[PDB]
């Protein structure tokens, strides 16, 4: 669960994990669905060590949220070989698992 403080931090994690899927959880502290799904994402991170999981607090790292056109909280963006390969929004556990399966 890498916390990404800047868009540059995101560019770096990407460089250091080229063929590996990265799952970025864009969230807000004040978002109830974000806080609700948070432990699920943490559990998945442990269940699937072959995938890199990161989090962006959209109020703190406004640059990354803007660069990814993130408006809905949570938004999960999936990145592999420096390209965005999928995204969806919502505290939707089944969709999170399916999307991770699809792209790992």
Sum up the structure in keywords.
104 residues; alpha/beta; Glutaredoxin; five-stranded mixed β-sheet; 26% strand; globular; redox-active center; Thioredoxin_CS; Thioredoxin; protein-disulfide reductase activity; disulfide bond
Record the SSE blueprint.
Elements lengths: L1 E2 L3 H9 L6 E6 L4 H16 L4 E6 L4 H6 L7 E6 L2 E7 L3 H11 L1
Parallel strand pairs: 1-3, 2-3
Antiparallel strand pairs: 2-4, 4-5
* CATH architecture label name: 3-Layer(aba) Sandwich
Can you identify the CATH superfamily?
Answer: Glutaredoxin
Strand content: 25-35%
The level-1 CATH class: Alpha Beta
Explain how this protein is built.
The protein is an alpha/beta fold and 104 residues long. The chain has a single domain (1-104), classed as Glutaredoxin (3-Layer(aba) Sandwich). The protein is 40% helix and 26% strand. It contains four helices and five strands. It has helices at residues 7-15, 32-47, 62-67, 93-103, and strands at 2-3, 22-27, 52-57, 75-80, 83-89. The protein has a five-stranded mixed sheet. The two termini are 17 Å apart. The PDB classes it as oxidoreductase.
Task: Put the structure in a nutshell.
With 104 residues, the protein is of the alpha/beta class.
